[PDB]
């Protein structure tokens, strides 16, 4: 009727609220572990960066990007897609390697020449060295990473506890390491190819950090998003509650009139 169709729809809205509540709590739980990982990762990164800074290493072109497989984690997926698009204008010929289904789908739409290597299955777990290493190893073999005159990784830096801003950084090429402004009394090995080895080592060490920063931003976004969902759902509960209440009153009155009409005759 009005009453039953209203009533079932309100029940649906209620169930939606319950799910959005549940997810929001679970997301918070997941987030605490995520943050813990990211802290450790970031600490490690600073040590590697210490060399690059002090060395003042100063760098087609590769673009690498990070998002999870998982969707509905707010606008992480599409803000990063937008910043990939921005730097895809800049260099038309760059080969984009997409680590994550979500960035794969969005990027594939904007230019379908980009995708050369892509991953799938990374997003559902915390960053782990094992993952980074394997991706790195494949990055060298499959894409022949050393060829590019620029490597750049794009990720979502989890800027503040309620924000994420898409960010990029350049992984220095092996050529870059060689010719580095201060490659002063850095190095002593002329035998071991410290540039060609350090390149490989920082390919992964940098990538792991990027993945870690990303994972934290992703889970943080999902928490934020599911929180806003709960609020939006609440508003819908209240609005349909008023509709329900009115509809209920109306049915009682309308039915009552029919009985009256009969008695009156």
């Amino acid at each position: 009727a009005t009453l039953k169709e209203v009533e079932m729809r309100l029940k649906s809205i209620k169930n939606i609220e319950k799910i959005t509540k549940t997810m929001k709590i679970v997301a918070s739980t997941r987030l605490s572990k995520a943050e813990k990982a990211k802290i450790s990762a970031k600490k490690m990164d600073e040590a590697e960066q210490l060399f690059y800074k002090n060395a003042e290493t100063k760098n087609k072109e590769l673009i690498v990007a990070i998002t999870s497989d998982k969707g509905l984690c707010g606008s992480i997926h599409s803000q990063l897609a937008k910043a990939v698009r921005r730097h895809l204008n800049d260099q038309p010929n760059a080969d984009i390697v997409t680590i994550g289904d979500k960035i794969k789908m969005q990027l594939l739409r904007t230019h379908p020449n980009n995708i050369k290597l892509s991953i799938n299955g990374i997003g559902k777990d915390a960053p782990t060295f094992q993952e980074s290493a394997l991706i790195a190893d494949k990055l060298l073999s499959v894409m022949k990473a050393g060829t590019y005159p620029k490597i750049s990784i794009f990720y979502n830096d989890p800027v503040s506890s309620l924000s994420f801003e898409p960010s990029e950084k350049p992984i220095f090429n092996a050529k870059t390491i060689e010719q580095s402004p201060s490659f002063g009394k850095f190095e002593i090995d002329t035998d071991a190819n410290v540039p060609r080895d350090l390149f490989e080592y920082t390919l992964a060490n940098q990538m792991l950090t990027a993945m870690a920063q990303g994972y934290a931003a992703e889970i943080s976004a999902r928490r934020n998003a599911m929180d806003n969902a709960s609020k939006n759902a609440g508003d819908m509960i209240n609005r349909y509650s008023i509709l329900y209440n009115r509809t209920r009153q109306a049915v009682i009155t309308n039915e009552l009139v029919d009985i009256i009409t009969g008695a009156s005759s």
Binding site: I115, K116, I119, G121, T128, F129, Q130, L134
Partner: peptide
């Protein structure tokens, strides 16, 4: 042990 577990699929693409 969890850090040694991994699960991924490198999906190659072209053109």
């Amino acid at each position: 042990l969890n850090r040694s577990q991994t699960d991924a699929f490198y999906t190659q693409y072209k053109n």
